[PDB]
Enzyme design. Structure first.
Site, PDB file in Angstrom:
ATOM      1  N   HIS A  39      30.474  46.212  31.008  1.00  0.00           N
ATOM      2  CA  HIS A  39      31.595  46.802  30.901  1.00  0.00           C
ATOM      3  C   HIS A  39      31.675  48.443  30.922  1.00  0.00           C
ATOM      4  CE1 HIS A  39      36.304  46.974  29.789  1.00  0.00           C
ATOM      5  NE2 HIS A  39      36.233  47.403  31.286  1.00  0.00           N
ATOM      6  N   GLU A  72      26.974  56.329  31.205  1.00  0.00           N
ATOM      7  CA  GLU A  72      25.882  56.444  31.961  1.00  0.00           C
ATOM      8  C   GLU A  72      24.882  55.650  31.248  1.00  0.00           C
ATOM      9  OE1 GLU A  72      26.717  60.260  34.846  1.00  0.00           O
ATOM     10  OE2 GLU A  72      24.998  60.340  33.475  1.00  0.00           O
ATOM     11  N   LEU A  95      31.197  37.595  28.911  1.00  0.00           N
ATOM     12  CA  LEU A  95      31.638  36.098  28.444  1.00  0.00           C
ATOM     13  C   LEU A  95      32.129  35.456  29.752  1.00  0.00           C
ATOM     14  CD1 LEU A  95      32.693  36.381  24.900  1.00  0.00           C
ATOM     15  CD2 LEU A  95      30.418  35.959  25.972  1.00  0.00           C
ATOM     16  N   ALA A  96      32.769  35.823  30.421  1.00  0.00           N
ATOM     17  CA  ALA A  96      34.077  35.273  31.643  1.00  0.00           C
ATOM     18  C   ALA A  96      33.952  36.111  32.854  1.00  0.00           C
ATOM     19  CB  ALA A  96      35.055  34.972  30.930  1.00  0.00           C
ATOM     20  N   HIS A  97      34.569  35.265  33.822  1.00  0.00           N
ATOM     21  CA  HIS A  97      34.978  35.986  35.134  1.00  0.00           C
ATOM     22  C   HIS A  97      36.029  36.705  34.603  1.00  0.00           C
ATOM     23  CE1 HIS A  97      31.917  35.147  38.102  1.00  0.00           C
ATOM     24  NE2 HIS A  97      31.720  34.008  37.607  1.00  0.00           N
ATOM     25  N   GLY A  98      36.175  38.054  35.256  1.00  0.00           N
ATOM     26  CA  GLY A  98      37.527  38.778  35.381  1.00  0.00           C
ATOM     27  C   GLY A  98      37.486  39.443  36.588  1.00  0.00           C
ATOM     28  N   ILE A  99      38.583  40.535  36.379  1.00  0.00           N
ATOM     29  CA  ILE A  99      38.871  41.489  37.627  1.00  0.00           C
ATOM     30  C   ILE A  99      37.356  42.210  37.987  1.00  0.00           C
ATOM     31  CG2 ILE A  99      39.911  43.143  38.973  1.00  0.00           C
ATOM     32  CD1 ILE A  99      41.689  41.994  35.943  1.00  0.00           C
ATOM     33  N   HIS A 100      36.690  42.598  36.841  1.00  0.00           N
ATOM     34  CA  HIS A 100      35.411  43.320  36.847  1.00  0.00           C
ATOM     35  C   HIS A 100      34.207  42.471  37.639  1.00  0.00           C
ATOM     36  CE1 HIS A 100      37.780  46.167  34.764  1.00  0.00           C
ATOM     37  NE2 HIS A 100      37.689  45.349  33.558  1.00  0.00           N
TER      38      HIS A 100
HETATM   39 CO   LIG Z   1      37.550  46.793  32.059  1.00  0.00          CO
END
Ligand SMILES: [Co+2]
Ligand SMILES: [Co+2]
Lengths: 118, 118
Positions: free
Chosen positions: A9, A45, A70-75
């Site tokens: 992230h 970077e 940990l989990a699926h998200g928008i990212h």
């Molecule tokens: Co984010």
């Protein structure tokens, strides 16, 4: 011919990037991969494309991207597959987008040891 | 007398909450804790204060809060310690704020398996 790209992230705080770097080092110590790079999605970077390019420039033809989340998200479902042109940069090679960490039993192990100040 | 509260980010997507719930179940299966609750920061229910109250109402006097996060961020250093009144609701009960997951060797294990589609 294989590269592992760890992807995270990234925060404005440095903890998240530290985390990725330490992880990459430990997988380096395990000697399983020819090339091992990290990339952060936001405000840090090296960035994910920078990491992928760096892998390619070192001559990797199969790039394994692992989302260290940990989990699926928008990212993990939008932004990263986007940044890797998997949805909707790279020539010749195939990108292999792996799964996140998920509710692995080893995490419940870590959680317990964490609960006990261990 | 001891409660474990698992605490997570929470997205508008449901994956994150699923993750917490499955984790809580697995620690329930391990039979180490009298009380085990989950709480998400934002977007979803139950919330962290809800989870703390729920633990207390079940009669716990030591609440172990584990942040199910890979790394430290604003959430783990500001918001959650805030929500738990640990910095700038509980009675005669002590909240024990544990560490995040961090660059644990079991995570590098998980990452490798994840890299191999395992
Ligand atoms: Co984010
Ligand atoms: Co957040």
């Amino acid at each position: 011919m294989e590269a592992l790209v760890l992807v995270g992230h990234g925060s404005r705080l440095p903890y998240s990037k530290e985390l990725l770097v330490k992880l990459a080092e430990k997988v380096k110590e395990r000697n399983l991969f020819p090339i091992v790079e990290i990339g952060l999605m936001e405000f840090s970077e090296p960035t994910i494309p920078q990491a992928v390019k760096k892998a390619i420039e070192q001559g990797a033809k199969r790039i394994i991207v692992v989302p260290v989340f940990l989990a699926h998200g928008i990212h993990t479902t939008r932004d990263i597959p986007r940044l890797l042109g998997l949805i909707e940069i790279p020539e010749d090679v195939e990108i292999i987008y792996r799964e996140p960490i998920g509710a692995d039993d080893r995490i419940v192990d870590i959680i317990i040891d964490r609960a006990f100040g261990r």
